[PDB]
Structure formats: C-alpha cells, structure tokens
Amino acid sequence: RPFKQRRSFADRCKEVQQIRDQHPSKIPVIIERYKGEKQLPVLDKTKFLVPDHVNMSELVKIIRRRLQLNPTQAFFLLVNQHSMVSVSTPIADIYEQEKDEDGFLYMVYASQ
C-alpha cells in the first residue's frame, strides 16, 4: 500500500521530526513505484535517508542497485508532482524546493 495511506499525516510529521532530531544530516525520502508501472519491481524498502550533501545522480544510483537493474535499463526517478530535476541538482536544493506538507520528499520510479 501507498505510504501516505499507511501512515496518518500526524504519524508522518512525527517521523520526519524524529529523523531531524536523531539524524540531522540526512534527508527523509519516500520512494515508491509509479502507479501504472509494469516492467519494474516493487522494492522491499520505501523510506530512505539520504546524506544531504549528495545530488540526484546518487539516488538514481542507489535505486538502480535496489531494483537490480542493468546498464541498459533507462528509468525515471520523478519528485513530487512528477517533476524531473537535474541529476546534478543536490538533494538539499531539491528537498527545500519540493518537500511535502508532512516533511518527507516523495519520489516515484518509472521506465519508457
């Protein structure tokens, strides 16, 4: 089930804050599969802490690994309102610019 439907807005704020208060150098990112995707698998992990010094290329690289992709597989990692951000764009720039009302940063992966 979608993370937003698995935890109440109340619950979610609280996690984000607990993350802030316990791991202040990490960005809280929720990563999930695009709703209408077929050719790419559901991952066991949806909650990701991402070192705030990195950029989008790092994330694209972690998700490849977890999805067990091969170089050939081009995929899209889209933030928030299906936005494409530069892979050079640092996640901390991305976070401030695109984070949800609940403190998390939501992304989805897709292909084609």
Curated annotation (Swiss-Prot):
UniProt GO cellular component terms: autolysosome; autophagosome; autophagosome membrane; cytosol; glutamatergic synapse; late endosome; microtubule; organelle membrane
Modification after translation, per record: The precursor molecule is cleaved by ATG4 (ATG4A, ATG4B, ATG4C or ATG4D) to expose the glycine at the C-terminus and form the cytosolic form, LC3-I. The processed form is then activated by APG7L/ATG7, transferred to ATG3 and conjugated to phosphatidylethanolamine (PE) phospholipid to form the membrane-bound form, LC3-II. During non-canonical autophagy, the processed form is conjugated to phosphatidylserine (PS) phospholipid. ATG4 proteins also mediate the delipidation of PE-conjugated forms.
Residues carrying Phosphoserine: S8
Entry keyword Lipoprotein: yes
Tissue: Most abundant in heart, brain, liver, skeletal muscle and testis but absent in thymus and peripheral blood leukocytes.
Effect after changing K47A: Decreases interaction with ATG13 and strongly reduces autophagosome formation
Domain of life: Eukaryota
Subunit structure: 3 different light chains, LC1 (a cleavage product of MAP1B), LC2 (a cleavage product of MAP1A) and LC3 (produced by one of the MAP1LC3 genes), can associate with the MAP1A or MAP1B heavy chains. Interacts with TP53INP1 and TP53INP2. Directly interacts with SQSTM1; this interaction leads to MAP1LC3A recruitment to inclusion bodies containing polyubiquitinated protein aggregates and to inclusion body degradation by autophagy. Interacts with ATG13. Interacts with ULK1. Interacts with TBC1D5. Found in a complex with UBQLN1 and UBQLN2. Interacts with UBQLN4 (via STI1 1 and 2 domains).
Record-stated family: Belongs to the ATG8 family.
Name of protein: Microtubule-associated protein 1 light chain 3 alpha
UniProt lineage: Eukaryota, Metazoa, Chordata, Craniata, Vertebrata
GN (gene name): MAP1LC3A
